[PDB]
Design a binder for these strands. Structure first.
Lengths: 48, 49, 48, 45, 260
DNA sequence: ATGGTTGGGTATAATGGGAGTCGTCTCGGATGCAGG
DNA sequence: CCTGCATCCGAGAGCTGAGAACCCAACCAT
């Protein structure tokens, strides 16, 4: 229903999984993800 | 965590006040309304289970 | 500090943000004259 | 034109009065509720 | 569900306006207003009555104090105008349509203004409706000759209506508007005094900063009158089994001991 | 005759919101979908 | 067209004790 504006969609998706002010895996969450997945995370969010 | 929530309210109010008023008369002290911060801390320390 | 993006006019100020309750030497708080304890919370850790 | 609204010992209670505290409006650091002139506390052991 | 999204969808279903379309609509409503006053002076009837009947006809029978026979008979009575007078009727009808269209197009300005008044005792939709009332008032009193944009004059009316609604409906115990603004000014002065002093001000400081005619007893009385009541259903204790009213005795009905 | 209370007005321009909630389990009825 | 079969929603889940604009002018009440 919401109009599919490019910037509005960008802001919504950025806030959902990519905004450090909204999405936050803790330091413990970062450590758990790194040890389970065997990767190195740049930050505490799902995407950059 | 409660402090962070209060700071989020403070920042939201600060942005609201920034998008208003003569930009020449705007000072750091004038933009910040601290009341939600006390609201959050006091609610945590008086009402949290 | 209040900073203009182009002008560079710097306005520095110390702001009173309020009061933070202080933990006593034994580890408790005095809220409205009553002794209180904050109980630690166990929950599921963030991660994958 | 006045009536008794005094504080009395509830049934099954009592003891020895060991402390009394009086707080009035205006004493430094006192923050009373609006309308309340003074508060009296009695500690009984 | 989610009525805010439904209202936003309905409000977005109406397209915006440009400057030319806006000035056209305002000119048409202005000429319609001039037409209804001209007609009222010609026939000698109350302008409000003829405006209401004309708008009732423009809406239709869907909009049911005036019996249908009455408004229909007046409509036929206005069909007795030879010429250069039915033009007044047509201009008035087009002006009413212009009024409707302009209000529908600019309801979004009401939404934009009201979205920054949330969290003050009134829900968002109530704020939107009061802003809509203010927008209708502004459309009524807008003069397009000044070449000013519609929003410039509409914003003041919308904000006035919203502020009046906050002052008049936010509290279960009604407090008059002057006392409401006095309380807000007291709170603002108190917070500035707290910022400057680094602690909660005493009543003396607030009274001093208020100005002449303000002393500690007056600020104490104002603060006592500004308290809002609490709910009888406030949960007491951790478990969900005790309410506040469980601790309130009745002092009106006589006790069995008193009755004897 | 006084305060307390109420109605009206402000003119550059402004035009679709925001918190939230994710660890119960079953059971019974109403219901839409799949097959024949 | 009938039927069965997942799917969704709603309604339950022991007792007692206690715990955030401002201003200006007209107008009824007492």
């Amino acid at each position: 229903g919401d109009p599919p504006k490019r910037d509005k969609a960008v802001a919504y998706v950025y806030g959902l999984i990519a905004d450090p002010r909204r999405y936050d895996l803790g330091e413990a969450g970062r450590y758990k993800a790194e040890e389970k997945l065997g990767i190195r995370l740049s930050g505490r969010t799902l995407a950059r | 965590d409660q402090f962070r929530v209060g700071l989020a309210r403070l920042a939201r109010g600060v942005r609201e006040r920034m998008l208003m008023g003569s930009e020449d008369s705007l000072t750091p002290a004038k933009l910040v309304n601290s009341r939600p911060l006390e609201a959050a801390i006091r609610e945590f320390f008086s009402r949290s289970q | 500090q209040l900073i203009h993006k182009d002008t560079g006019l710097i306005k520095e100020d110390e702001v009173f943000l309020g009061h933070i309750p202080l933990m006593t030497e034994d580890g408790s708080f005095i809220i409205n004259g009553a002794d209180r304890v904050i109980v630690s919370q166990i929950h599921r850790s963030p991660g994958v | 034109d006045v009536k008794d609204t005094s504080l009395r010992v509830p049934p099954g209670e009592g003891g020895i009065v060991v402390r009394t505290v009086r707080l009035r409006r205006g004493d430094p650091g006192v923050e009373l509720k609006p309308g309340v002139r003074e508060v009296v506390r009695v500690y009984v052991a | 569900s989610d009525p805010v999204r439904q209202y936003l969808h309905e409000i977005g279903q109406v397209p915006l306006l440009t400057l030319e379309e806006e000035v056209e609509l305002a000119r048409k409503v202005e000429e319609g207003m001039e037409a209804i006053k001209k007609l009222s002076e010609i026939t000698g009837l109350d302008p409000d009555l003829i405006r209401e009947v004309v708008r009732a006809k423009i809406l239709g029978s869907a909009r049911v104090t005036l019996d249908p026979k009455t408004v229909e008979e007046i409509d036929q009575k206005l069909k007795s105008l030879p010429k250069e007078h039915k033009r007044y009727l047509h201009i008035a009808r087009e002006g009413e349509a212009a009024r409707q269209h302009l209000i529908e197009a600019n309801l979004r300005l009401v939404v934009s203004i009201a979205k920054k008044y949330t969290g003050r005792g009134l829900s968002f939709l109530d704020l939107i409706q009061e802003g809509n009332q203010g927008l209708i008032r502004a459309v009524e009193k807008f003069e397009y000759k000044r070449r000013f944009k519609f929003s410039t004059y509409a914003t003041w009316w919308i904000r006035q209506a919203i502020n009046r609604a906050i002052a008049d409906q936010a509290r279960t115990i009604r407090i008059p508007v002057h006392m409401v603004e006095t309380i807000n000014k007291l709170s603002r002065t108190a917070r500035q005094l707290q910022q400057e002093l680094g602690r909660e001000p005493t009543y003396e400081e607030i009274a001093e900063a208020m100005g002449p005619g303000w002393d500690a007893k007056r600020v104490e009385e104002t603060l006592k009158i500004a308290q809002e009541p609490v709910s009888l259903e406030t949960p007491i204790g951790d478990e969900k089994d005790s309410f506040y009213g469980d601790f309130i005795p009745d002092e009106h009905l006589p006790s069995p001991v008193d009755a004897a």
